[PDB]
Amino acid sequence: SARSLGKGSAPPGPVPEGSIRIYSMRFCPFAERTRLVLKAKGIRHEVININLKNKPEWFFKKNPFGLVPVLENSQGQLIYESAITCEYLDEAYPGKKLLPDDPYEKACQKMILELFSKVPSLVGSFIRSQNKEDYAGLKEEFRKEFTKLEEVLTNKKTTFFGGNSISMIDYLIWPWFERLEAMKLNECVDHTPKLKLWMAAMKEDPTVSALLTSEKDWQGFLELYLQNSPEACDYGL
Amino acid sequence: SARSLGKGSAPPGPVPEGSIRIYSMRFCPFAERTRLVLKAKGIRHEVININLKNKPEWFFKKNPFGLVPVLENSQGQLIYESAITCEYLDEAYPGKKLLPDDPYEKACQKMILELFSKVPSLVGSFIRSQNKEDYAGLKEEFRKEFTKLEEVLTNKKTTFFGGNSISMIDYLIWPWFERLEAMKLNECVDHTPKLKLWMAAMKEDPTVSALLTSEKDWQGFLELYLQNSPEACDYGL
Ligand SMILES: *CC(=O)Nc1ccc(Cl)c(S(=O)(=O)N(C)C)c1
Ligand SMILES: *CC(=O)Nc1ccc(Cl)c(S(=O)(=O)N(C)C)c1
């Protein structure tokens, strides 16, 4: 049932009242942001996984960019871009607010997100590699970006990037730090102690712990991904 | 007095109570967004222009990226990234809200901003050109992106990107459309009629009209810019 929908599959049909739909992919770190917010805010939702190597024709109607995550509500409104879906969920649904009310504190979280901006493309370059010589250079590129995040934690004198308690910014940058160990990149945080202590503190958060994918599951997906397999998205039953 | 501050200049000192400071550059389209918001919301402010070809040492303390626009308030809080400065100004100051209260309508504006994302880099490629052969190809690249904006106006059945009246998204994407005529790129909107009618309607907005820089002033700045002159930022006294 959690199996990804591809070419030849039928459109999902209307989203029922009282629930929101997320078009996701179980191994997508960008869609993981939305799922972390949905869980944290306890929002009632339905998941539809998209086979990103063999996309359905109807998926481009949901998002012209053809990317996960996408939200769809009962009135048929469509929201895409991982950071936009996350802000939308915090505003449109009740409970503990992940984004702070203060305009400056809100701005700060968005500034920290911009400081992290180069990390996903760097994770992408490390994955798609042809030789072991490029590895040391990319590791230094990681350190250069991870030092930007360290300076923020040092200046704020706080555990998390948004305060003493976990907030939106932590969930937005976490998926890439989650995959560092599986990719054997833990040494890239050896010069950022406050960033290293932030990771262990994050791993203990009940929301983060519940959605955390295993080392072998990421290694198994990435193996099929680097083979451009249409079974990658469906790795692990 | 409106003259840009460069190497050898002294730090500005504290921002007084009741006013906000913007670190800008009179020809910067990204900083123009912030200035359009400051004007539209009638915010009391002080402008400090930065010589971007010969930056002051103290400017990297205001923004690690060393880019304009930057906001600084009386309590010393610093806000950078043009879109972040604009959202901050709408939330922290009273009057007519440029961003709508509705979470979906807010999300939509941010989605339209993402649809425009490739235009500034395209304007940059057209400016830095070595031959007239690349011109036709880049014009087609413009049409491909300007068609994304046309589809939004067509679907919404509205004059502006955020409704029947001007909002935040219009001010955020305007500076690049402002410079199209000066760069002789008006033919790139010949296949987007609703986008072409949006430009003329924008040119009539009192906020847009008041901050509008002349054709020759942009041509004169760009000439000095493509000469990498430290007088570019100060073109036109
Ligand atoms: C949703 C998505 O883009 N998923 C995905 C899968 C695998 C990797 Cl390595 C990444 S990434 O963020 O590292 N990058 C875009 C290559 C993302
Ligand atoms: C503030 C700034 O970056 N100013 C600037 C000056 C000249 C041009 Cl052409 C641009 S652009 O947006 O076209 N691009 C970054 C080249 C921006």
Residue numbers in the entry:
A (entry chain A), B (entry chain A): 5 to 241
Recite the paper's sentences:
Among them, the omega GSTs (GSTO) belong to an atypical cytosolic class. Consequently, instead of glutathione conjugation, GSTOs catalyse thioltransferase reactions similar to glutaredoxins. We determined the structures of GSTO1 bound to three inhibitors (C1-27, C1-31 and C4-10) by X-ray crystallography.
The structure of the GSTO1–C1-27 complex was solved to 2.4 Å resolution with three molecules per asymmetric unit. The bound C1-27 interacts predominately with residues in the H-site with only three interactions with the glutathione-binding site (G-site). The backbone amide nitrogen of F34 from the G-site stabilizes the acetamide oxygen position via a hydrogen bond and the phenyl ring of F34 packs edge on with the phenyl group of C1-27. The chloride is located in a hydrophobic pocket interacting with I131 Cδ1, V127 Cγ1 and W222 Cζ.
